[PDB]
C-alpha cells in the first residue's frame, strides 16, 4: 500500500512530467516497486529546472497572457511499472470525468506530459497516453522505433533519433582502422534498436562483430561477471567494446573490471548513456581511462546556474525531494528539518552551498526546450482558435488533444541557444553531436575532454588529441593484413574477418583476394602476381660460348677445305687426278664444302626458310656428304666385281668411263626424292618448347624419323661400300689408296653408329648435330687427301 509524492504547482492549465528522481529498483525489490536512492543530476536538477522554467513562463507577458500554467511532477524511477502507475495517476481524473458526469470538482485534467527520460518507459507510457489524446513531448527518448507515427501518433521529442548515432559510431570505428569489435547493449528497446542499427550498418562497411551481448541494468555481480568472462575470450583480438548501454550498466562494467583485476585492459566505446556522467565513473575511474564516447550536443543554461545555487533547504517550499537530496549528497542529518534521515551522522554545517563540486547537467537544455515547445504549442492554439481574447475563452473548455497535436506538429521557435527548433513529419528534431574522451589530465585527476563533433557524416575530430600518440591501442583486427602481393586470403567460413593466410605458388598468381589462378603454358606470373608475363626463347644466333668453339672448329674445317682446294682445284700438276676423273674429287670437295657450309647454317632463329635451310643441312647435307664419297668409293667396284677379281658372267656397266661416271651419278637423287616427299608431308616451320615452366625454347618441327630417314638409306650404303671394298684392303692400288679408303670407311662408320643415342639421349642435340657433321667431314679428307697429295710433292 505504497504511495508516491506528487510535486504539484497549481494553475489553470496542468502539464505533467516524468523525471527520474530515484534510481531504478534492484532485483528482489521490483515486485515491491521500492525505488532506490535519489539521482542528483537526472532527478531533482530537472525538477528545479522545470519549476524555474514555469516561473519564467508565468512571468512572460509574451507567452500566454492571462493564462496560468500549473504542473504535476511524478517520479519515474527508470522502470516501466513505476511510471505506468504514475501515468494512471495522471489519467485517473480523465477516467472519473466520464463516470461521475452522468449522475451517480477534483482537478483539471492534464493536457500534456513531458518525459520520461528513457526509451522503453516512454514506449510504455504512450500506450496509455494515446488513448486519451494526451500528447507527449520527450527529452531523451532517442530510440529509432519512435518514428512510426502510424503506430505512435501522439509522441514527440526535441532530440534526434539514435538511428544516426549508430551511423556516427560506425564512422568513428571506420576512421580508426577498427575491424573486429565487441558490442554490448542494454536490454530494453533503446539498446536493442541502437545495436540493431549498428550491426545492420556494420556489414555495409564490412566491420565484423565478435559477439553481441545483451544484459539488464539490474544485473547482480554473479550474473554480471559472466559478461566479462565472455568478453575476455576475445583477447587481444577484440580490444574495443561498442556500448549502447545506459549509465548504470557501464558503471557495472567498470565495477566488474575492478573486481577482476582487468584495470586498463581494453578500451570501450559508448553512446550517450555515459557522455558527461561523472557518477558512472566516480570510484571506478582508473578502469575507464582512454574511453571514448559520444554526446548529443547541448550548451549550458546560464539561468539555471544562478537560480540553482541559490536554493536552500530552508527556503524551497515546493519540492518534496529536496530535503532527501540535501541528506544524500552531503551525508548528514538535519536537526529541525522534517525529513530527518537519522541514519546519517555528522550533522551538516549551515554554511554549505551547492557550487562545491557543481556539475551542470548535459541534457537539461533539452528539457527547457521541451517545456518551451509545450508553451509555444498552447500559444499557437490560442492564436489559431481564440484570436481576440487574452486568456482561455470557451474554445478551449475543455482542451482537445487533437487540435493540440495539430498545433504542436507545426511549431517553429528559437531554442535557448537561439537554435531554430522544428522537426519533420515524425516528431524528431534534428541536432548535432560531440565526442569526448576520458583520460588522465593530471595525476590523480581524470576528466572528460572534448575531441570533435559530427553532423550528417561530417566527422571532424583530432587524432593527436587521443592517446597523445599516433601509436594507439591495438586495432581490433582478427587476421593481420598479410597481403604482400603473394599471400592469399582464406576465410574459415565463420566470420568474414578471421581469415587464414596462405602463400601462392610460383605457377600461381593473385587473380583475386580469395583464389590464385595458374598461368598458361610457359607464361610466367609477374612480381605482384597479377598478370602472366612471358619468358623469351633461347634463340641462339650468336651461339653459346662453348659451341662457339665448335663454330671456330668448323671455321678450321673451312680453312682445311681452302688448303686442299688451293692445290687440288687450281694447281693441277697432279697426274693421278687428270688420269682419273676430276669429277670424283670435285664431288668430294663439293659435298665436304656443303657440309661445312650447313654447319654454320644451324645457329639461327628457326624461321620458315631457316628451318628449310636446317632441314636441308640435316637431310641432304648428310646425303650429299656421302654422295661425295660414294662415287669414287664405288668407281673401283666396276673394276673389282666387273673384270678380273670377282668373276661374274655379266657386265653391269657401259662401254665408256664417262658413261661409267654417268652410272655412278644415278644414286644421288634417290635420297633427294624422299626428302622432297618429307617436305611435302611436313613443311619446315617453327615450334616452341617448354621443358620446364621457366625454360622457353623455339625449335623447328622435327620428328624422330625425320633424321633417321636420311640415315636409314645411308646406313645400308656403309655395308654396301664395305662389301664393295672388303678385299681391297689387301689390294695395293695407287699408293695403297684402297687401304686408306677402307681405313677411312672404318673411321667414318663409328660416329654414324654413335650419333643415335648421343642425339636422342641429350636435351639439346643441336650442337651434337654440327659436331657429328664436322666429325663425319674431317676424317674423310684427313685420311685420303693428305697422303695422296703430300707423297707426290
Amino acid at each position: 500500500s505504497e504511495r508516491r509524492v506528487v510535486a504539484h504547482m497549481p494553475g489553470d492549465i496542468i502539464i505533467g512530467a516524468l523525471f527520474s528522481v530515484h534510481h531504478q529498483p534492484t532485483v528482489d525489490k521490483v515486485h515491491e516497486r521500492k525505488c532506490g536512492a535519489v539521482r542528483e543530476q537526472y532527478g531533482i536538477q530537472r525538477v528545479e529546472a522545470m519549476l524555474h522554467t514555469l516561473e519564467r513562463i508565468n512571468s512572460d507577458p509574451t507567452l500566454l497572457p492571462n493564462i496560468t500554467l500549473g504542473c504535476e511532477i511524478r517520479d519515474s524511477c527508470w522502470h516501466s511499472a513505476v511510471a505506468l502507475e504514475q501515468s494512471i495517476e495522471f489519467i485517473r481524473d480523465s477516467l472519473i470525468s466520464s463516470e461521475e458526469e452522468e449522475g451517480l470538482r477534483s482537478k483539471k485534467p492534464i493536457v500534456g506530459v513531458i518525459g520520461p527520460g528513457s526509451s522503453s518507459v516512454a514506449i510504455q507510457v504512450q500506450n496509455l497516453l494515446q488513448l486519451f489524446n494526451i500528447p507527449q513531448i520527450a527529452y531523451s527518448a532517442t530510440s529509432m522505433d519512435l518514428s512510426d507515427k502510424t503506430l505512435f501518433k501522439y509522441f514527440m521529442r526535441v532530440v534526434p533519433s539514435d538511428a544516426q548515432q549508430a551511423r556516427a559510431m560506425v564512422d568513428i570505428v571506420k576512421r580508426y582502422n577498427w575491424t573486429y569489435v565487441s558490442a554490448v547493449h542494454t536490454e530494453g528497446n533503446y539498446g536493442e534498436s541502437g545495436m540493431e542499427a549498428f550491426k545492420d550498418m556494420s556489414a555495409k562497411e564490412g566491420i565484423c562483430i565478435a559477439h553481441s551481448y545483451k544484459i539488464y541494468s539490474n544485473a547482480g555481480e554473479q550474473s554480471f561477471d559472466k559478461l566479462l568472462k565472455k568478453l575476455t575470450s576475445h583477447l587481444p583480438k577484440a580490444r574495443v567494446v561498442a556500448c549502447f548501454c545506459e549509465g548504470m550498466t557501464v558503471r557495472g562494467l567498470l565495477m566488474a573490471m575492478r573486481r577482476l583485476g582487468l584495470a586498463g585492459e581494453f578500451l570501450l566505446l559508448g553512446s550517450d548513456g555515459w557522455a558527461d556522467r561523472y557518477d558512472v565513473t566516480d570510484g571506478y575511474q582508473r578502469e575507464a581511462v582512454g574511453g571514448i564516447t559520444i554526446k548529443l550536443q547541448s550548451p549550458d543554461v546560464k539561468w539555471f546556474d544562478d537560480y540553482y545555487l541559490k536554493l536552500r533547504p530552508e527556503t524551497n517550499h515546493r519540492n518534496p525531494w529536496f530535503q532527501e537530496f540535501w541528506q544524500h549528497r552531503f551525508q548528514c542529518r538535519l536537526e529541525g528539518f522534517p525529513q530527518e534521515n537519522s541514519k546519517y551522522n555528522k550533522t551538516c554545517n549551515s554554511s554549505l552551498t551547492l557550487k562545491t563540486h557543481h556539475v551542470q547537467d548535459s541534457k537539461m537544455g533539452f528539457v527547457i526546450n521541451a517545456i518551451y515547445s509545450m508553451a509555444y504549442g498552447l500559444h499557437n492554439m490560442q492564436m489559431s482558435l481564440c484570436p481576440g481574447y487574452a486568456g482561455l475563452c470557451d474554445a478551449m473548455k475543455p482542451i482537445d488533444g487533437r487540435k493540440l497535436l495539430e498545433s504542436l506538429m507545426k511549431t517553429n521557435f528559437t531554442g535557448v541557444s537561439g537554435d531554430t527548433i522544428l522537426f519533420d513529419e515524425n516528431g524528431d528534431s534534428p541536432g548535432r553531436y560531440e565526442i569526448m574522451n576520458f583520460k588522465e589530465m593530471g595525476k590523480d585527476y581524470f576528466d572528460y575532454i572534448n575531441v570533435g563533433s559530427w553532423d550528417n557524416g561530417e566527422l571532424k575530430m583530432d587524432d593527436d588529441e587521443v592517446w597523445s600518440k599516433k601509436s594507439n591501442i591495438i586495432r581490433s583486427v582478427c587476421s593481420e593484413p598479410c597481403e604482400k602481393g603473394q599471400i592469399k586470403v582464406i576465410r574459415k567460413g565463420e566470420v568474414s574477418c578471421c581469415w587464414t593466410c596462405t602463400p601462392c605458388k610460383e605457377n600461381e598468381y593473385v587473380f583475386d583476394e580469395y583464389t590464385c589462378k595458374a598461368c598458361q603454358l610457359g607464361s610466367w606470373p609477374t612480381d605482384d602476381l597479377t598478370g602472366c608475363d612471358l619468358i623469351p626463347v633461347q634463340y641462339l644466333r650468336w651461339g653459346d660460348p662453348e659451341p662457339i668453339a665448335a663454330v671456330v672448329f668448323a671455321c678450321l674445317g673451312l680453312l682445311a677445305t681452302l688448303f686442299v682446294t688451293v692445290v687440288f682445284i687450281i694447281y693441277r700438276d697432279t697426274p693421278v687426278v687428270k688420269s682419273s676423273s676430276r669429277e670424283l674429287c670435285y664431288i668430294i670437295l663439293a659435298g665436304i664444302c656443303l657440309g661445312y657450309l650447313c654447319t654454320f647454317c644451324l645457329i639461327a632463329k628457326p624461321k620458315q626458310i631457316y628451318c628449310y635451310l636446317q632441314r636441308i643441312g640435316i637431310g641432304l647435307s648428310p646425303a650429299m656428304s656421302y654422295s661425295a664419297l660414294v662415287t669414287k668409293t664405288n668407281r673401283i667396284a666396276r673394276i673389282l666385281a666387273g673384270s678380273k677379281k670377282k668373276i661374274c658372267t655379266k657386265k653391269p656397266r657401259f662401254m665408256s668411263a664417262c658413261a661409267q661416271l654417268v652410272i655412278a651419278f644415278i644414286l644421288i637423287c634417290i635420297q633427294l626424292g624422299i626428302i622432297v616427299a618429307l617436305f611435302i608431308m611436313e613443311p619446315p616451320d617453327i615450334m616452341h618448347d617448354y621443358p620446364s615452366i621457366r625454360e622457353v625454347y623455339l625449335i623447328c618441327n622435327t620428328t624422330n624419323l625425320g633424321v633417321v630417314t636420311p640415315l636409314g638409306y645411308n646406313g645400308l650404303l656403309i655395308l654396301s661400300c664395305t662389301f664393295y671394298a672388303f678385299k681391297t684392303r689387301n689390294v695395293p692400288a695407287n699408293f695403297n689408296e684402297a687401304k686408306y679408303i677402307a681405313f677411312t670407311m672404318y673411321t667414318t662408320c663409328i660416329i654414324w653408329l654413335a650419333f643415335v643415342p648421343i642425339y636422342f639421349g641429350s636435351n639439346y642435340k643441336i650442337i651434337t648435330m654440327c659436331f657429328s657433321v664436322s666429325l663425319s667431314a674431317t676424317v674423310a679428307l684427313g685420311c685420303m687427301f693428305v697422303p695422296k697429295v703430300y707423297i707426290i710433292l
Partner: nanobody, 123 residues
C-alpha cells in the same frame, strides 16, 4: 489530502497518565512529519511536540521534556502521545497537525489540523 482526528480527551486526576490519539484519514502519511499544539482557555496556541517523517528524530518542548512521550505508527497511519505527570496547568485544547516543507523546528509549515480535544486535570 489528509485530515486529522484527535481523541482521548477528558477529565483526569493530578499526576496521572493519558494517551491521546491522532488518526490520519488519507494516504502518503509516511511523507509527513507531525506536530502537536495545545491552547489553554485564554492563553495562546503553543507548540508542544514533534516527530519526523521517518521517525527517530522526535522533538519536545522544554516544558514537557521527559514527561510526554510521542510515538507514531506507519502501518495504521496514526501517531500517539502517551502523557505522564499530569498537572492542572496542562488543561488545554490539544491539537494535532501534520507538516512538510519545514525549517529548523519549531519553524515548520503546518498544512492541516484536526478537530481538537479537551483535557482537564483536576486536583
Amino acid at each position: 489530502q489528509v485530515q486529522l482526528v484527535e481523541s482521548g480527551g477528558g477529565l483526569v486526576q493530578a499526576g496521572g497518565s493519558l494517551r491521546l490519539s491522532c488518526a490520519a484519514s488519507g494516504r502518503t502519511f509516511t511523507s509527513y512529519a507531525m506536530g502537536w499544539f495545545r491552547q489553554a482557555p485564554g492563553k495562546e496556541r503553543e507548540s508542544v511536540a514533534a516527530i519526523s517523517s521517518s521517525g527517530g528524530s522526535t522533538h519536545y518542548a522544554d516544558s514537557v521534556k521527559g514527561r510526554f512521550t510521542i510515538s507514531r505508527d506507519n502501518s495504521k497511519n496514526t501517531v500517539y502521545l502517551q502523557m505522564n505527570s499530569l498537572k492542572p496547568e496542562d488543561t488545554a485544547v490539544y491539537y494535532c497537525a501534520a507538516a512538510m516543507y519545514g525549517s529548523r523546528w519549531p519553524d515548520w509549515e503546518y498544512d492541516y489540523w484536526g478537530q481538537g480535544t479537551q483535557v482537564t486535570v483536576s486536583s
